[PDB]
Design a protein around this ligand. Structure first.
Ligand code: HEM
Ligand SMILES: [Cl-]
Ligand SMILES: [Cl-]
Ligand SMILES: [Cl-]
Ligand SMILES: [Zn+2]
Ligand SMILES: [Zn+2]
Length: 196
């Protein structure tokens, strides 16, 4: 009955909290990697004399600098989602006590926070997808200038960039699970009200 539902809603919300934390942490790790990659890039780009290599490295550098801002915006929306979660927690625990009693505004509020969190999650996924895509384009660009012999520093850059991709992917994967939890929270939630 609702008792198992209330338990399930509660468990999902807890999972969601653990995951969100886990994601914030991975995104700070990504930011450190981006900043480290940029440092290696700008040295390589400055040291380059071959014009083809130089122009390529410059395009990748420029784009990598832009990822920093995208990541900051991602971090902020992350931290916003944690704040909405706090209010879901607080409002939720009052609904626990109140049930369906009184006017609907508290139930509405809970429901709207869940809506906003869902929207932040999508924005999050879209920003992430934009970073990943351009990061894969940079792998491609590096490959165009690693023909033949040499490029030992270019290979270090390729390697750090591939490692960044791995981390980005790990993170899109956690966010997918987060959006899935939120779906489930909405489904179990609605059922709590329907059964009421
Ligand atoms: C928007 C659709 C949702 C509806 C209709 C809904 C409905 C409810 C209801 C009726 C309760 C009271 C029962 C209980 O306390 O277990 C509740 C509690 C709660 N909800 Fe939701 N909810 C929704 C989404 C969310 C989301 C997305 C989260 C978190 C991301 C969340 C977190 C909570 C929490 C933490 C509680 C208190 C759990 C507890 O400690 O008892 N809810 N929700
Ligand atoms: Cl060169
Ligand atoms: Cl590009
Ligand atoms: Cl992918
Ligand atoms: Zn990047
Ligand atoms: Zn690019």
């Amino acid at each position: 009955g609702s008792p198992e539902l209330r338990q399930e809603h509660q468990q999902l919300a807890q999972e969601f909290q653990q995951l969100l934390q886990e994601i914030q942490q991975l995104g700070r790790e990504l930011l450190k990697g981006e900043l480290q990659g940029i440092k290696q890039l700008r040295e390589a780009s400055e040291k380059a004399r071959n014009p083809e290599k130089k122009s390529v490295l410059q395009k990748i550098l420029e784009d990598e600098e832009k990822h920093i801002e995208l990541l900051e915006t991602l971090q902020q929306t992350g931290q916003e989602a944690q704040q909405l979660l706090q209010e879901l927690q607080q409002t939720g625990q009052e609904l626990w006590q109140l049930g369906g009693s009184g006017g609907p505004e508290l139930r509405q509020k809970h429901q709207q926070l869940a809506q906003k969190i869902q929207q932040l999650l999508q924005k999050h996924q879209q920003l992430g997808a934009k970073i990943l895509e351009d990061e894969e384009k940079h792998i491609e660009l590096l490959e165009t200038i690693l023909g033949g012999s040499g490029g030992d520093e270019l290979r270090e850059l390729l390697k750090g960039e591939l490692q960044g991709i791995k981390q980005y992917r790990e993170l899109q994967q956690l966010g997918q699970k987060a959006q899935q939890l939120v779906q489930k929270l909405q489904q179990t939630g609605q059922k709590l009200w329907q059964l009421g």
